[PDB]
Amino acid sequence: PQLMPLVVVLSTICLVTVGLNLLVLYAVRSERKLHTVGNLYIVSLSVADLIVGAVVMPMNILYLLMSKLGRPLCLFWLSMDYVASTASIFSVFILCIDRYRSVQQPLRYLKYRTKTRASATILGAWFLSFLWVIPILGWNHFMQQDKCETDFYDVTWFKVMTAIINFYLPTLLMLWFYAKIYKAVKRQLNRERKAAKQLGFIMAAFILCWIPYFIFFMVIAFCKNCCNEHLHMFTIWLGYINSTLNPLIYPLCNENFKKTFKR
Numbered sequence: 647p648q649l650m651p652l653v654v655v656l657s658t659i660c661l662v663t664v665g666l667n668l669l670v671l672y673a674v675r676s677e678r679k680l681h682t683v684g685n686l687y688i689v690s691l692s693v694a695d696l697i698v699g700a701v702v703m704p705m706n707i708l709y710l711l712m713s714k715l716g717r718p719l720c721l722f723w724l725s726m727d728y729v730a731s732t733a734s735i736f737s738v739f740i741l742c743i744d745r746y747r748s749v750q751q752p753l754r755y756l757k758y759r760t761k762t763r764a765s766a767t768i769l770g771a772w773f774l775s776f777l778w779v780i781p782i783l784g785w786n787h788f789m790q791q792d793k794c795e796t797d798f799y800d801v802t803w804f805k806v807m808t809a810i811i812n813f814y815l816p817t818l819l820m821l822w823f824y825a826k827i828y829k830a831v832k833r834q835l836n837r838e839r840k841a842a843k844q845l846g847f848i849m850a851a852f853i854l855c856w857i858p859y860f861i862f863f864m865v866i867a868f869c870k871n872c873c874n875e876h877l878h879m880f881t882i883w884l885g886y887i888n889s890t891l892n893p894l895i896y897p898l899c900n901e902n903f904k905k906t907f908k909r
């Protein structure tokens with residue numbers, strides 16, 4: 647009776663998130679000058695972003711309006727949320743791989759940046775994401791140990807290991823890549839400058855949005871009586887606000903999106 651208007655606001659977030667994602671997808675599939683050989687990489691993120699919104703928005707809202715469906719639907723919800731997040735933070739990983747390779751002194755380079763390899767690496771990211779999904783459905787039947795939380799919530803060590811891997815290794819390798827990109831930018835004395843700003847703003851938006859979620863998650867990872875239902879919702883939804891913002895963060899630095907966004 648005192649939290650429903652907030653639920654309505656989070657529901658209103660859905661329309662703009664889905665609209666922005668579909669707008670980016672249509673922009674890529676329309677303009678040849680915008681149909682860049684590398685833009686397809688970021689498209690993966692957008693596609694993942696779109697999935698996120700849908701597969702998370704009503705269901706999680708249906709989690710808030712209701713108090714504490716069945717097993718298959720909620721399990722699929724968790725699995726697809728996990729695959730969407732992993733696919734996003736590996737589309738960004740592929741983007742940083744490609745920026746690192748392309749800005750590294752391109753003498754015997756620029757010949758491994760085609761579109762077939764773009765599709766191949768996107769397919770590989772999707773396949774590895776599904777391989778990460780498989781544990782969500784099959785935590786049981788592999789090991790032998792009303793609400794539907796993560797199935798391995800009672801297992802602290804696996805939780806810590808997966809969080810550590812899927813945050814540190816992407817984010818730390820990404821910071822390495824961004825630092826070397828910035829070093830190359832500084833030594834190479836504007837489109838490259840705006841690409842650097844785009845990568846920097848995407849980095850700032852995750853780090854800032856998913857540092858509270860991860861810090862509180864890792865505090866939970868060793869103690870149970872340390873976070874209620876409140877200090878977690880306000881972090882998950884800042885992260886999803888970040889996912890919504892990324893389609894609008896794209897034109898801020900790479901503003902070639904002018905004509906296609908105002909057709």
Ligand SMILES: Clc1ccc2c(c1)CCc1cccnc1C2=C1CCNCC1
Nearest residue numbers: 727728731732735805808809812813856
């Ligand atoms: Cl960068 C990032 C940030 C958060 C998460 C991931 C990736 C996926 C892996 C992962 C593993 C253990 C616990 N939580 C998660 C995350 C979730 C929970 C499900 N809903 C989406 C957010």
